[PDB]
Amino acid sequence: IANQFNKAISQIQESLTTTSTALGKLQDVVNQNAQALNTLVKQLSSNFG
Amino acid sequence: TDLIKNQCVNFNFNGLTGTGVLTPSSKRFQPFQQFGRDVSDFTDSVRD
């Protein structure tokens, strides 16, 4: 059991290291926040007539 | 007139007005550029 546990940990480390989908959810939130701010500011350049 | 630096002043450059803090820059302008802007369309730096 100890061996399997230890192995699994090493497995996770490599999985995270070489991937690009891990924590995608956190990146998503950040991206959404940035978009909201970018939109808000950009519209300052609108003439509105 | 002179240039007042490192403090908020009222400015009026050759076609650019407003208030702010004037400091020296390291921006590399082209031979045919008068002033620059930030990512958002506001004046960032000005050629004297």
UniProtKB/Swiss-Prot annotation, chain B:
Attaches the virion to the cell membrane by interacting with host receptor, initiating the infection. Binding to human ACE2 and CLEC4M/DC-SIGNR receptors and internalization of the virus into the endosomes of the host cell induces conformational changes in the S glycoprotein. Proteolysis by cathepsin CTSL may unmask the fusion peptide of S2 and activate membrane fusion within endosomes. This is Spike protein S1. It comes from Severe acute respiratory syndrome coronavirus. The chain holds residues 517 to 564 of 1255 of the full protein.
